[PDB]
């Protein structure tokens, strides 16, 4: 894509007299182990929640 447009809010914040605005960047690594277990079941339940709108089912 276009780097300037996608990063435009950060580009504007990093060059500004206003100091209240802050940029926070997070990179998550090795979260597959965290993906194992509870939150996988949470995703499954979130998907299952839509079955109440469709009649026929087993």
């Amino acid at each position: 894509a276009l780097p300037h447009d996608v990063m435009a809010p950060q580009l504007a914040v990093t060059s500004s007299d206003d100091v209240s605005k802050i940029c926070v960047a997070k990179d998550f690594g090795q979260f597959d182990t965290s993906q194992w277990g509870q939150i996988s079941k949470a995703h499954a339940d979130g998907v299952r929640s839509m079955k109440a709108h469709y009649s026929m089912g087993h």
Partner: protein
């Protein structure tokens, strides 16, 4: 619907245990109108969309 045929013994000497009172659903519906309507409309809509 096709009528059921009962054995002659059941007609002469048959008894059934049944509670014939009808309980009104008004206390649930009147107090909770939005919740009751949303539950029944969604289930009814679910069946009709599958026609």
């Amino acid at each position: 619907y096709r009528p059921r045929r009962f054995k002659e013994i059941e007609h002469t000497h048959g008894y059934v245990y049944r509670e014939l009172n009808q309980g009104s659903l008004l206390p649930l519906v009147d107090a909770n109108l939005k919740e009751s309507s949303s539950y029944y409309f969604k289930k009814l809509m679910s069946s009709i969309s599958n026609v």
